[PDB]
Amino acid sequence: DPTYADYFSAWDKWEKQALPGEERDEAVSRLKECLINNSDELRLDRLNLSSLPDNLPAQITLLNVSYNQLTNLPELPVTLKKLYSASNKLSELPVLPPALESLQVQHNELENLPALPDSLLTMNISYNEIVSLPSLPQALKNLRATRNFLTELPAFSEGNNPVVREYFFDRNQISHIPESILNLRNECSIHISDNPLSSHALQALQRLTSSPDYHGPRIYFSMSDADAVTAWFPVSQIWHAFEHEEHANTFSAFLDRLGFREQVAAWLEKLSASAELRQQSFAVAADATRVALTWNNLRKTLLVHQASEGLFDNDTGALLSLGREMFRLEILEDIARDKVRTLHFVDEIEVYLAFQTMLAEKLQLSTAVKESGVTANDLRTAEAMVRSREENEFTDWFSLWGPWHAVLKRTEADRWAQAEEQKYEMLENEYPQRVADRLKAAQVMRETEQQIYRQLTDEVLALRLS
């Protein structure tokens, strides 16, 4: 809270530090004139200023410093209602006064925004390098963000009364439309052309907005948006893997390669070295023409070849707890498949991974990265359903599990061989019960081996370590 003389002398010193090519002298006269009166407005635009003084008149409600060479703004007056600072070289904004209604800082070098007050009605942040936004106030009816580095459309809320709202997010890096935009009324307009959007969300946007019986928001968009495919985004072994490219099932088994990116390379890692892995990965990973049930399969095909070696010979305790995780994952996939029915702009794999990471803590899914439309209720129900199906189905499931059948195939025979030798049921009772209720209405070939392998898993090989 400076005194008149402090303002004057601070501005006089600030003037003598003028870089040539700027009108600091004129700004001081406008600053003094602003102080001398009760003036709510201060305009220092188009003077090519290289900086503002530290202390600006504390009572002003409008500040225009557009078209200068500013890299920084000082602490803005708390009574500020409208801040025009377009066409500068700003790297950061200060904290915004709480009563701000308008913010024009387009054509700067901004990477981030401070907290937007609740009073903000209009905002122009276009032609910056912003990567993501804070939560936007509801009073915000006009927002222009053209040509930034945004990755995500913000989830709007339908205000209780309908007012015209316009959002320009064109020429960004947005890749995912949130399901929330269909809540909004027709009085709101969204511009998302020139964004790297999926062709799925494109075709969804096409289908819904190109229907009669559509009362949502006006969304403006443009649908205009073999072997050297695998090692690209993980560099060197593109030639090493080409030796394997001259083989079977590589056109739909490699082109279909659409945190996670880190160890998709560490799953690339041993399929790289050993030919045993994807002599059989491409087995059912190319004839499935849902990609989370497959992604789980190649997890399994990975895990059977390890169990083929014998990592779980005496350590079946850690094999069992891993099947507990992988069972809850394959329940989560069915949760995911159930939800994508109701979502338009995402497919199962994305929803699956949303469930996996948002629940990795609560359900102890170690094999998950610690990073959409998934609410808080479908997280609660997802846990309630996996926990109950776990209680009812895990042991039957683990007895049929692949990795464990492998460690029995390697470690500890007898029972394993005996189990296979009890194939009497597959011919002494398999023809009568074959359609014994298919006409009273291979399903029992899965029901019979369940019985024996669970029976094998009655007098288990796990009661030798414990």
UniProtKB/Swiss-Prot annotation:
GO terms for molecular function: ubiquitin protein ligase activity; ubiquitin-protein transferase activity. It comes from the Bacteria. Residues 3-223 are annotated as: Interaction with target proteins. It catalyses: S-ubiquitinyl-[E2 ubiquitin-conjugating enzyme]-L-cysteine + [acceptor protein]-L-lysine = [E2 ubiquitin-conjugating enzyme]-L-cysteine + N(6)-ubiquitinyl-[acceptor protein]-L-lysine. GO terms for cellular component: extracellular region; host cell cytosol; host cell nucleus. It is found in: Secreted; Host cytoplasm; Host nucleus. Residues 226-466 are annotated as: E3 ubiquitin-protein ligase catalytic domain. Its main location: secreted. LRR repeats lie at residues 38-58, 59-80, 81-98, 99-120, 121-138, 139-160, 163-184, 186-209. Keywords: Host cytoplasm, Host nucleus, Leucine-rich repeat, Plasmid, Repeat, Secreted, Transferase, Ubl conjugation, Ubl conjugation pathway, Virulence. Its EC number is 2.3.2.27. Ubiquitinated in the presence of host E1 ubiquitin-activating enzyme, E2 ubiquitin-conjugating enzyme and ubiquitin. Residues 226-466 form the NEL domain. Pfam families: LRR_TTSS, NEL. Exists in an autoinhibited state in the absence of substrate protein, due to interactions of the leucine-rich repeats with NEL domain. Is activated upon binding to a substrate protein. GO terms for biological process: protein K27-linked ubiquitination; protein K48-linked ubiquitination; symbiont-mediated suppression of host innate immune response. The LRR (leucine-rich repeat) repeats are involved in substrate recognition with target proteins. Also interacts with human and mouse U2AF1 (U2AF35). Belongs to the LRR-containing bacterial E3 ligase family. Effector E3 ubiquitin ligase that interferes with host's ubiquitination pathway and modulates the acute inflammatory responses, thus facilitating bacterial colonization within the host cell. Interacts with IKBKG (NEMO) and TNIP1 (ABIN-1), a ubiquitin-binding adapter protein, which results in TNIP1-dependent 'Lys-27'-linked polyubiquitination of IKBKG. Consequently, polyubiquitinated IKBKG undergoes proteasome-dependent degradation, which perturbs NF-kappa-B activation during bacterial infection. Mediates polyubiquitination of host U2AF1, leading to its proteasomal degradation. This is E3 ubiquitin-protein ligase ipaH9.8. It comes from Shigella flexneri serotype X (strain 2002017). The gene is ipaH9.8.
